Design a protein around this ligand. Structure first.
Ligand code: HEM
Length: 153
């Protein structure tokens, strides 16, 4: 709906805070994914076969860091331009996700795990506005990735 300039500023603030402790917060993110949907474990190469979510895995860390940064960058582009631009990068993400057996109905899983991660990251700074902002950003980004999935047969 929104992303006013103060909504964008909040996504940016919260993303910085997230990024201040990548080892902690990415690990936390993957724990929350599996609590929502244990079956999702099998899609991720760095998880498959583990007992617990690894705490010092650079593949896990770079993957989840990239996820959060793309949603934040989507937030700023919606706020500045009024859209999410479909580029070659998101086109490539559409093909990638179809290849790894990701489907439209998986996207709400990663959404809730992002909202809960950010909630834990900001602590007492959490607000309704913050939550709405990451929700819009995620949804608009997901629309474009799903279109390219649908498109990337
Ligand atoms: C807005 C939502 C999403 C974003 C921004 C996103 C971002 C990405 C990125 C950046 C990559 C890595 C591309 C590369 O470096 O090759 C990737 C890979 C992947 N994603 Fe997503 N993702 C999203 C949603 C999902 C969902 C809903 C699922 C399924 C639960 C999922 C599962 C996967 C898997 C299995 C991989 C491959 C990684 C591997 O081979 O271990 N993603 N995603």
């Amino acid at each position: 709906g929104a992303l006013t300039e103060s909504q964008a500023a909040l996504v940016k603030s919260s993303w910085e805070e997230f990024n201040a402790n990548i080892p902690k917060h990415t690990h936390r993110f993957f724990i929350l994914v599996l609590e929502i949907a244990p079956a999702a474990k099998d899609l991720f190469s760095f998880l498959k076969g583990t007992s617990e979510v690894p705490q010092n895995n650079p593949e896990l860390q770079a993957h989840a860091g990239k996820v959060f940064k793309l949603v934040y960058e989507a937030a700023i582009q919606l706020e500045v331009t009024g859209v999410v631009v479909t580029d070659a990068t998101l086109k490539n993400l559409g093909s990638v996700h179809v290849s790894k057996g990701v489907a439209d109905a998986h996207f709400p899983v990663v959404k809730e795990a992002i909202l809960k991660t950010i909630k834990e990251v900001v602590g007492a700074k959490w607000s309704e506005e913050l939550n709405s902002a990451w929700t819009i950003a995620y949804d608009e980004l997901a629309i474009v990735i799903k279109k390219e999935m649908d498109d990337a047969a």
